[PDB]
Protein backbone atom coordinates (compact mmCIF):
# COMPACT_ATOMS: atom_id res chain seq x y z
CA UNK A 1 0.00 0.00 0.00
CA UNK A 2 0.99 3.57 0.81
CA UNK A 3 3.93 4.61 2.96
CA UNK A 4 5.39 7.85 4.28
CA UNK A 5 9.14 8.46 4.14
CA UNK A 6 9.60 9.92 7.66
CA UNK A 7 8.38 9.73 11.27
CA UNK A 8 9.28 13.38 11.95
CA UNK A 9 10.18 16.48 9.91
CA UNK A 10 12.49 19.19 11.27
CA UNK A 11 11.86 22.66 9.81
CA UNK A 12 14.98 24.85 10.22
CA UNK A 13 14.06 28.52 10.13
CA UNK A 14 15.33 30.07 6.86
CA UNK A 15 14.45 27.06 4.71
CA UNK A 16 11.92 27.89 2.02
CA UNK A 17 10.40 24.40 2.14
CA UNK A 18 10.90 20.89 3.47
CA UNK A 19 9.60 17.74 1.72
CA UNK A 20 7.92 14.47 2.83
CA UNK A 21 7.94 11.45 0.49
CA UNK A 22 4.69 9.53 -0.01
CA UNK A 23 4.96 6.23 -1.95
CA UNK A 24 2.63 3.52 -3.26
CA UNK A 25 4.23 0.20 -4.26
CA UNK A 26 1.05 -1.29 -5.71
CA UNK A 27 0.54 -0.94 -9.43
CA UNK A 28 -3.11 -2.03 -9.05
CA UNK A 29 -4.40 0.43 -6.38
CA UNK A 30 -5.38 4.07 -6.51
CA UNK A 31 -5.73 6.56 -3.67
CA UNK A 32 -6.82 10.09 -2.97
CA UNK A 33 -4.31 11.73 -0.58
CA UNK A 34 -5.39 14.62 1.59
CA UNK A 35 -3.08 16.41 4.03
CA UNK A 36 -3.15 19.29 6.47
CA UNK A 37 -1.33 20.76 9.40
CA UNK A 38 -2.46 21.12 13.00
CA UNK A 39 -0.93 23.09 15.86
CA UNK A 40 -0.11 21.35 19.12
CA UNK A 41 -3.58 22.33 20.42
CA UNK A 42 -5.15 19.96 17.83
CA UNK A 43 -6.55 22.67 15.52
CA UNK A 44 -5.90 23.35 11.80
CA UNK A 45 -3.27 26.05 11.61
CA UNK A 46 -2.14 28.19 8.70
CA UNK A 47 1.36 29.08 9.94
CA UNK A 48 2.70 26.17 7.74
CA UNK A 49 1.22 25.33 4.30
CA UNK A 50 1.38 21.79 2.83
CA UNK A 51 0.88 21.28 -0.92
CA UNK A 52 -0.66 19.77 -2.72
CA UNK A 53 -3.38 19.50 -0.08
CA UNK A 54 -5.16 16.86 -2.17
CA UNK A 55 -3.84 14.69 -4.99
CA UNK A 56 -4.52 11.37 -6.66
CA UNK A 57 -1.97 8.57 -6.53
CA UNK A 58 -2.57 5.97 -9.21
CA UNK A 59 -0.32 2.87 -9.10
CA UNK A 60 3.39 2.40 -8.30
CA UNK A 61 4.48 5.98 -7.68
CA UNK A 62 6.46 8.39 -5.60
CA UNK A 63 4.94 11.78 -4.77
CA UNK A 64 6.39 14.56 -2.58
CA UNK A 65 4.51 16.82 -0.14
CA UNK A 66 6.01 20.29 0.29
CA UNK A 67 5.74 22.01 3.67
CA UNK A 68 6.26 25.79 3.59
CA UNK A 69 6.92 28.18 6.42
CA UNK A 70 4.24 30.87 6.33
CA UNK A 71 4.81 31.62 10.03
CA UNK A 72 5.48 35.32 9.38
CA UNK A 73 7.74 35.94 12.34
CA UNK A 74 5.25 34.82 15.01
CA UNK A 75 7.14 31.94 16.61
CA UNK A 76 9.11 31.76 19.81
CA UNK A 77 12.79 32.15 18.84
CA UNK A 78 14.21 30.50 21.92
CA UNK A 79 12.81 26.95 21.65
CA UNK A 80 11.33 24.53 19.13
CA UNK A 81 7.58 24.60 18.37
CA UNK A 82 5.54 21.45 17.68
CA UNK A 83 3.05 20.98 14.86
CA UNK A 84 1.42 17.84 13.49
CA UNK A 85 1.28 16.78 9.83
CA UNK A 86 -1.88 14.87 9.08
CA UNK A 87 -2.06 12.64 5.99
CA UNK A 88 -5.00 10.55 4.96
CA UNK A 89 -5.20 8.10 2.10
CA UNK A 90 -8.65 7.14 0.66
CA UNK A 91 -8.64 3.98 -1.46
CA UNK A 92 -10.53 4.03 -4.76
CA UNK A 93 -13.46 1.62 -4.23
CA UNK A 94 -14.52 3.78 7.02
CA UNK A 95 -11.48 2.38 5.20
CA UNK A 96 -9.19 5.46 5.19
CA UNK A 97 -5.46 5.27 6.06
CA UNK A 98 -4.43 7.96 8.52
CA UNK A 99 -1.08 8.98 10.06
CA UNK A 100 0.03 11.95 12.09
CA UNK A 101 3.71 12.87 12.27
CA UNK A 102 5.62 15.56 14.21
CA UNK A 103 6.79 18.76 12.58
CA UNK A 104 9.41 20.50 14.75
CA UNK A 105 10.02 24.15 13.82
CA UNK A 106 13.58 25.07 14.87
CA UNK A 107 14.62 28.72 15.22
CA UNK A 108 18.13 29.83 14.15
CA UNK A 109 20.76 30.57 16.80
CA UNK A 110 19.88 28.26 19.71
CA UNK A 111 23.01 28.09 21.89
CA UNK A 112 22.99 24.30 22.60
CA UNK A 113 23.36 22.18 19.44
CA UNK A 114 20.96 19.28 18.81
CA UNK A 115 23.61 16.61 19.40
CA UNK A 116 24.44 17.90 22.89
CA UNK A 117 20.80 18.03 24.11
CA UNK A 118 20.39 14.40 25.27
CA UNK A 119 23.36 14.50 27.67
CA UNK A 120 21.78 17.46 29.52
CA UNK A 121 18.78 15.47 30.87
CA UNK A 122 18.50 15.71 34.64
CA UNK A 123 16.99 12.95 36.73
CA UNK A 124 15.76 13.43 40.29
CA UNK A 125 14.50 10.56 42.46
CA UNK A 126 11.32 12.03 44.00
CA UNK A 127 11.79 9.93 38.87
CA UNK A 128 11.39 13.44 37.47
CA UNK A 129 13.14 14.20 34.15
CA UNK A 130 14.16 17.82 33.52
CA UNK A 131 15.10 19.14 30.04
CA UNK A 132 17.07 22.42 30.17
CA UNK A 133 17.40 22.61 26.37
CA UNK A 134 15.15 24.30 23.80
CA UNK A 135 14.40 20.98 22.07
CA UNK A 136 11.61 18.43 22.28
CA UNK A 137 13.46 15.22 23.15
CA UNK A 138 12.09 11.76 22.53
CA UNK A 139 13.49 9.42 25.18
CA UNK A 140 13.34 5.65 24.63
CA UNK A 141 14.99 2.54 26.03
CA UNK A 142 14.95 4.30 29.43
CA UNK A 143 16.27 2.03 32.17
CA UNK A 144 16.75 2.55 35.90
CA UNK A 145 18.63 -0.46 37.27
CA UNK A 146 17.32 -3.60 35.51
CA UNK A 147 13.87 -2.07 35.15
CA UNK A 148 12.68 -0.96 31.72
CA UNK A 149 10.63 2.27 31.93
CA UNK A 150 8.14 3.75 29.44
CA UNK A 151 9.11 6.03 26.53
CA UNK A 152 8.53 9.73 27.04
CA UNK A 153 8.77 13.03 25.18
CA UNK A 154 10.16 15.96 27.29
CA UNK A 155 9.30 19.43 26.05
CA UNK A 156 11.75 22.31 25.95
CA UNK A 157 12.61 23.53 29.48
CA UNK A 158 10.11 21.02 30.89
CA UNK A 159 9.73 18.20 33.33
CA UNK A 160 7.95 14.90 33.06
CA UNK A 161 7.47 12.18 35.65
CA UNK A 162 8.23 8.56 34.92
CA UNK A 163 6.44 6.07 37.08
CA UNK A 164 8.66 3.20 38.27
CA UNK A 165 7.43 0.26 40.40
CA UNK A 166 9.21 1.70 43.50
CA UNK A 167 12.60 3.24 42.75
CA UNK A 168 22.28 3.30 36.76
CA UNK A 169 19.91 5.42 34.66
CA UNK A 170 20.47 4.97 30.93
CA UNK A 171 18.54 5.70 27.72
CA UNK A 172 18.70 6.59 24.02
CA UNK A 173 16.89 9.37 22.09
CA UNK A 174 15.43 9.51 18.54
CA UNK A 175 17.44 11.97 16.51
CA UNK A 176 16.44 14.33 13.73
CA UNK A 177 16.65 11.58 11.07
CA UNK A 178 14.45 9.17 13.02
CA UNK A 179 17.41 6.98 14.11
CA UNK A 180 18.31 5.74 17.61
CA UNK A 181 21.36 7.40 19.26
CA UNK A 182 23.99 5.58 21.28
CA UNK A 183 23.24 4.83 24.93
CA UNK A 184 23.66 7.74 27.32
CA UNK A 185 24.04 7.83 31.10
CA UNK A 186 21.82 10.49 32.66
CA UNK A 187 22.80 13.36 34.97
CA UNK A 188 21.40 12.22 38.34
CA UNK A 189 20.68 14.76 41.10
Residues that bind a copy of itself (CB under 8 A): 1-7, 12, 14-16, 21, 23, 25-26, 60, 87-89, 94-100, 115, 140-141, 147-148, 150-151, 174-175, 177-180
Largest CA distance in the chain: 58
Rounded to a whole number of angstroms, the minimum distance from the CB of residue 39 to a copy of itself is 15
* Contact yes or no for 116/62 (Cβ under 8 A): no
Residue 23 bridge partners (DSSP): 3, 62
For residues 47 and 88, which CB has a smaller minimum distance to a copy of itself in the complex? 88
* b/e map 48-67, b = 16+ CB within 10 Å: bebeeeeeebeeebebebeb
Rounded to a whole number of angstroms, the minimum distance from the CB of residue 30 to a copy of itself is 16
3-state secondary structure of 40: coil
For residues 38 and 122, which CB has a smaller minimum distance to a copy of itself in the complex? 38
For residues 79 and 172, which CB has a smaller minimum distance to a copy of itself in the complex? 172
Rounded to a whole number of angstroms, the minimum distance from the CB of residue 58 to a copy of itself is 16
For residues 78 and 115, which CB has a smaller minimum distance to a copy of itself in the complex? 115
* Contact yes or no for 188/171 (Cβ under 8 A): no
Which residues are within 8 A (CB) of 180 and not within 5 positions of it... i.e. 6 or more apart?
Answer: 140, 141, 172, 173, 174
Rounded to a whole number of angstroms, the minimum distance from the CB of residue 189 to a copy of itself is 26
Amino acid sequence: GVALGATRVIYPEGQKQVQLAVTNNDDKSSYLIQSWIENAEGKKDARFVITPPLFSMQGKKENTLRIIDATNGQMPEDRESLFWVNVKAIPAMQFAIVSRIKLLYRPQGLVIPPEQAPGKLEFTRELTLFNPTPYYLTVTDLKAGNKSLENTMVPPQGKVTVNIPGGDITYKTINDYGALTEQVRGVVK
